[PDB]
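Dataset card, provenance and construction

Sequences and ligand SMILES were collected as paired inputs. For each pair, a complete structure of the chain with the small molecule in place was predicted and serialized as structure tokens. The example below shows a pair involving calcium ion. Curators did not alter the output after generation; any descriptive sentences attached to a record were derived from the structure itself.
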Amino acid sequence: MGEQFCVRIEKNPGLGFSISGGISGQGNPFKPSDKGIFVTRVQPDGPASNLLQPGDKILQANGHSFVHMEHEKAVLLLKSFQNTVDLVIQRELTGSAYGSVKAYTNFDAERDALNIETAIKTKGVDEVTIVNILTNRSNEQRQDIAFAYQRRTKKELASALKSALSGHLETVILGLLKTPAQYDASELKASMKGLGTDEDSLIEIICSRTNQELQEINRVYKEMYKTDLEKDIISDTSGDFRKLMVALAKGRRAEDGSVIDYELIDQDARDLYDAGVKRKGTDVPKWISIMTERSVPHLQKVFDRYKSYSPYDMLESIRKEVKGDLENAFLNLVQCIQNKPLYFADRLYDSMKGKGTRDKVLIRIMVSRSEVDMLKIRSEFKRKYGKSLYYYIQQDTKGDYQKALLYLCGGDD
Ligand SMILES: [Ca+2]
Ligand SMILES: [Ca+2]
Ligand SMILES: [Ca+2]
Ligand SMILES: [Ca+2]
């Protein structure tokens, strides 16, 4: 028998976890046939760290039974509870093999594929079911579902959904079906097809992805297009902007070991100052070398130490020293080093704050960060803007497209 635990979470500003499931059949990435409400992601340095774990089933929250609850009501209740939430949790007994709570089987993939086929082919197309299933499974499970779908229908799932869907919802769903590396590779290819119209997407991806992520992107890009990503970047960029993006795309940044090199932190800070604000012009290769080669924790401390020498911080110094695509690239890079979840929170705010929506940016971030740091993004967003990321999506989008984005958000804050 599973064990029931009592857990108290202090919001700061949210609960630091996401949920999936519900009585309407969303499923979840752990026990999809169980209709309960499941914890899916837990923010590692957050309010629920070392209290909740992925796969935990919520039985009760602040005196409300969560057995036989709709997903949207669970989202509402957990967000609406003030300050402190007392949960009753059901957790399966596990040993050294941590990952056994994810009991997703090959038949789960078959049943998911069958239910998606039924939704695709029913009168009017059942977009609610398609969105409910695919946004409440992991990316790995979506690969399993697509394989099972083709085995049953002799037709590719992506092709069937392209015919059944349209508009922004089609963009979201087709993006979710690709592996993380496939999605980034295809977004990079799309950005270089314009050749000067969408450097923002190239900059966003290349500046924010880690060594391991860029290694896989480079491999998958070559497999998908029979061309080296570096060669297409060179053909798409020029000047020092080309040099910066080529260096970043190699994904050969130093990884920070166990020792903080305080002497090098000070020397890098002085070198960045001497190469820019202190002198006429700019020594751009020095900026490129330091900001692409040093580890991220090292550069976080470098940028702080830089403020000891310079009247302007690193971001303001960039705006004073360089212009154009090069300036944009440096500003994005420094934000990604300083606080990557805040970087994406600001980009999400920018994509929705004004008239209409920059749907291309909103979709790309919600898809690509849904299984990386969405909870950290949500925390920074709520702390800065006062309302949740969920709230902004709710006000800027509508219909099944809105619902898909809200599922990728993982909950309200
Ligand atoms: Ca419909
Ligand atoms: Ca279509
Ligand atoms: Ca200067
Ligand atoms: Ca708007």
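Derived descriptions for this record:
The longest helix spans residues 324-352.
Residues 3-91 form a domain with the Pdz3 Domain fold (CATH 2.30.42.10).
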